[PDB]
Amino acid sequence: LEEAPWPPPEGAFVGFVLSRKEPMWADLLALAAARGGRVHRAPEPYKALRDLKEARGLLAKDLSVLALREGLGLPPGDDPMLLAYLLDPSNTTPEGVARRYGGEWTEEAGERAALSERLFANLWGRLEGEERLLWLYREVERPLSAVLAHMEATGVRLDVAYLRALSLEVAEEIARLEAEVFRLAGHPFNLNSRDQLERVLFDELGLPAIGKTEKTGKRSTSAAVLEALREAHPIVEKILQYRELTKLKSTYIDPLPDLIHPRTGRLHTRFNQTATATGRLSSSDPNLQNIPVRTPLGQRIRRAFIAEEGWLLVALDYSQIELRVLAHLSGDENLIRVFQEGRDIHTETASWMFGVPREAVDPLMRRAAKTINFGVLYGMSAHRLSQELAIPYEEAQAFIERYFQSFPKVRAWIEKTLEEGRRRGYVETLFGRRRYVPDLEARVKSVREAAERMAFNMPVQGTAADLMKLAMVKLFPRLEEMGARMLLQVHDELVLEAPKERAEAVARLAKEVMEGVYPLAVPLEVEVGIGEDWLSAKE
DNA sequence: GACCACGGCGCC
DNA sequence: AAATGGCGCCGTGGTC
Numbered sequence: 001l002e003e004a005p006w007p008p009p010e011g012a013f014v015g016f017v018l019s020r021k022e023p024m025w026a027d028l029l030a031l032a033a034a035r036g037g038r039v040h041r042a043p044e045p046y047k048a049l050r051d052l053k054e055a056r057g058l059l060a061k062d063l064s065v066l067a068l069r070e071g072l073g074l075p076p077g078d079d080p081m082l083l084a085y086l087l088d089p090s091n092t093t094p095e096g097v098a099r100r101y102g103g104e105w106t107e108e109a110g111e112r113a114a115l116s117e118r119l120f121a122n123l124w125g126r127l128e129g130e131e132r133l134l135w136l137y138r139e140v141e142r143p144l145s146a147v148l149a150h151m152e153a154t155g156v157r158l159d160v161a162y163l164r165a166l167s168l169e170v171a172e173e174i175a176r177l178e179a180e181v182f183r184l185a186g187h188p189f190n191l192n193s194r195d196q197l198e199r200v201l202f203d204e205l206g207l208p209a210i211g212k213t214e215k216t217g218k219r220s221t222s223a224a225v226l227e228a229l230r231e232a233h234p235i236v237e238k239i240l241q242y243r244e245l246t247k248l249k250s251t252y253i254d255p256l257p258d259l260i261h262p263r264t265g266r267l268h269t270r271f272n273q274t275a276t277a278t279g280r281l282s283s284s285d286p287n288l289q290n291i292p293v294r295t296p297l298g299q300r301i302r303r304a305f306i307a308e309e310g311w312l313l314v315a316l317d318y319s320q321i322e323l324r325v326l327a328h329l330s331g332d333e334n335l336i337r338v339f340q341e342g343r344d345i346h347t348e349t350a351s352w353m354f355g356v357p358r359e360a361v362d363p364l365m366r367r368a369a370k371t372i373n374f375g376v377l378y379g380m381s382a383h384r385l386s387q388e389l390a391i392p393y394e395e396a397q398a399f400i401e402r403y404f405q406s407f408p409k410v411r412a413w414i415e416k417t418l419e420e421g422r423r424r425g426y427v428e429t430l431f432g433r434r435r436y437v438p439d440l441e442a443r444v445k446s447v448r449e450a451a452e453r454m455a456f457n458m459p460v461q462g463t464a465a466d467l468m469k470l471a472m473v474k475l476f477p478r479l480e481e482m483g484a485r486m487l488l489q490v491h492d493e494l495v496l497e498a499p500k501e502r503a504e505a506v507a508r509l510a511k512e513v514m515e516g517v518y519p520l521a522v523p524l525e526v527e528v529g530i531g532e533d534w535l536s537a538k539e
Numbered sequence: 540g541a542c543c544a545c546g547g548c549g550c551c
Numbered sequence: 552a553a554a555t556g557g558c559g560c561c562g563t564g565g566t567c
């Protein structure tokens with residue numbers, strides 16, 4: 001392309017180079033734009049940002065987040081990544097998308113700008129005739145990228161002092177556990193090494209191996225294996241406790257306080273829009289979609305996520321979302337009726353599991369039942385089921401047959417979904433998001449059946465994903481108008497931050513928006529809480 | 540220092 | 552571990 005002076009004309013596509021992948025932490029090393037057979041390179045990248053009306057191009061959101069960081073209201077616009085991702089969600093990297101749709105991802109801003117231009121042209125062409133994918137792009141993905149940009153640049157507050165103090169307490173308990181483990185082994189070793197631990201458990205001590213690892217076929221020391229060996233030796237329980245503590249300390253307690261941004265004094269994640277096979281977002285650097293909540297220490301960590309002074313967190317979470325979605329997709333009357341009657345399948349399963357009345361079910365019991373309900377739905381084997389419930393095989397098997405015989409059209413929907421996936425090569429969500437699953441026609445049964453579970457899960461998980469995205473796009477402008485902030489999405493959950501005076505009003509509005517987003521054959525219900533911290537807000 | 544595969548495990 | 556699905560990050564062991 002012909003080189004020309006900065007600035008570019010309106011509608012130009014941008015290319016840019018960051019010192020590191022995370023836009024909140026990156027230095028903008030270079031910036032360029034391309035349009036009409038010209039490439040414009042900015043002599044001073046930061047100042048040049050002011051000349052752009054929007055960020056249009058590959059990884060648009062990243063540039064937008066950096067702009068917002070610098071106090072510039074630069075929204076993201078067209079991004080070829082989003083087009084490619086809709087065409088085929090295995091399109092997750094600019095490297096792959098460039099190669100596939102007409103160019104090469106290099107380290108020069110001008111070349112990236114030019115690449116962005118031609119990829120958009122090509123990919124736009126590929127979306128012609130694809131009306132449903134076009135709808136998702138214009139009505140969901142493109143607007144959502146703006147929403148996510150604001151969320152990333154906003155961040156969430158963390159009680160750093162609290163976490164620092166907690167680290168010290170946890171360190172001392174870890175020391176007690178490791179000392180016991182070493183005593184019981186008869187000698188010290190690296191307890192963080194599963195290879196060393198395998199030899200201690202299975203070679204040095206008497207313990208029977210139960211399972212093997214996938215890639216290298218070592219004797220597994222996974223939590224599943226250790227639970228089964230709980231009554232074989234006292235060292236086992238000590239290791240399980242050591243694992244829990246060290247996992248939480250190494251992954252959350254210690255790293256996160258070090259990631260507070262110096263300017264904002266908050267913790268900023270990345271919400272990746274082209275990262276999953278089903279249409280879910282992912283979160284990284286750090287991942288804020290896997291903050292602990294199940295165990296006592298886990299809850300203590302989640303409590304570190306707090307509202308700004310004078311504000312409150314609002315947490316909203318769709319009730320039994322994929323089950324409701326399944327009712328709609330399958331059209332099973334029986335299942336639809338369950339939700340019309342305001343029943344809770346997780347609580348009911350839980351009451352069965354632990355053999356207690358529905359009122360006796362505590363949250364942790366209900367949570368346990370989720371794994372069982374979704375596990376069975378998406379193809380769990382009777383054997384594992386019996387195993388994880390520690391009930392005889394016959395009972396487990398019996399539960400799965402009743403599970404489905406209760407809901408006739410569910411199996412029918414699955415069969416229909418797979419048959420259609422085999423013919424077309426892909427399956428799709430309610431709104432037409434696609435996932436290609438070529439292994440539906442695999443001649444190896446284990447490979448084929450794995451593919452089948454991936455395939456019939458996607459429309460359900462993906463539709464739920466679509467619904468949340470649509471809800472975020474609708475909700476965002478309403479929140480802006482109320483002076484509230486959207487902070488995090490955790491798949492079927494949103495966490496907002498509102499001024500105390502308005503927190504109650506915001507919760508009600510957000511609840512109604514989420515419930516009314518796209519009516520199905522069954523009501524959508526959203527549970528909402530308000531609190532000074534994430535844990536409090538969910539209770 | 541950075542990458543990697545692996546086993547493992549946090550969440551949804 | 553096992554015929555649930557979807558993610559990202561940890562330390563280890565290893566290479567470069």
Ligand SMILES: NCCCC#Cc1cn([C@H]2C[C@H](O)[C@@H](COP(=O)(O)OP(=O)(O)OP(=O)(O)O)O2)c2ncnc(N)c12
Nearest residue numbers: 317318319320321322323367370371374375491492551556
């Ligand atoms: N906090 C949940 C911890 C255990 C779990 C879970 C799982 C959650 N999902 C998927 C299905 C669910 O609708 C969705 C939302 O997660 P969710 O909100 O935990 O589950 P839910 O909304 O059904 O129940 P609730 O009324 O409490 O919101 O994530 C799953 N899909 C496949 N296998 C699994 N084990 C799970």
Ligand SMILES: [Cl-]
Nearest residue numbers: 025258259260
């Ligand atoms: Cl950093």
Ligand SMILES: [Cl-]
Nearest residue numbers: 363366367370
């Ligand atoms: Cl839960």
Ligand SMILES: [Mg+2]
Nearest residue numbers: 317318319492
């Ligand atoms: Mg939910």
Ligand SMILES: [Mg+2]
Nearest residue numbers: 317318492493
């Ligand atoms: Mg949830």
Ligand SMILES: [Mg+2]
Nearest residue numbers: 544545546547
């Ligand atoms: Mg892995």
